[PDB]
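Appendix B: complex inputs.
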Amino acid sequence: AAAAAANLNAVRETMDVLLEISRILNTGLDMETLSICVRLCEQGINPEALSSVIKELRKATEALK
Amino acid sequence: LVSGFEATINKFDKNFSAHLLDLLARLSIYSGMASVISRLDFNGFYTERLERLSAER
Amino acid sequence: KSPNVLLQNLCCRILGRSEADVAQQFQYAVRVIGSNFAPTVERDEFLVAEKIKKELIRQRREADAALFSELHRKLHSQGVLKNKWSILYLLLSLSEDPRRQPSKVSS
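Resulting structure:
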């Protein structure tokens, strides 16, 4: 719609603000991966649980390289 | 009997070591107050045997 | 959203591999998420904000700590995310202190 395109503007801004926050803290992730984690957090999630996954899945894919 | 000597001593030792680590732990959680531990092993022998096993999340 | 397939989208991004090929690694991911889905603490995005300021101040990158004070407002401004605490709680956990390299891409 139009008010549904105003919401897509409202999220493309936020995903970009969190990317500037992503690079000043030097995370290994980029805009696509970051776009998943906001959707998880909207439902409510444990970031103590999420961070242990990401340090594992990024650590165990250079054995398939 | 060593079912009346050594077994009882080991049972007491289990319970006593458990209570001793409990007491040292219950001071270490908050933060001289640490001087009670510092005196008791002045050599630093058994200075800390719990390395704090981890938990999920 | 429905979080069981949403975590499956996530493993398609980190891994470059097919999720129909490898599924053992995705099983370890469901192991940790669905045992503790809720955090062990309450919401305070204020306490986590004053440690990201405290992170850039101790490096003496003080121009970027005032840029960050402007980025922290914008997350409240839109309000399309219910827990703005968790997204910052997540980004602090994935951080590193490089002790080099300050640059900008804002605006």
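Helices of chain B lie at 6-28, 35-40.
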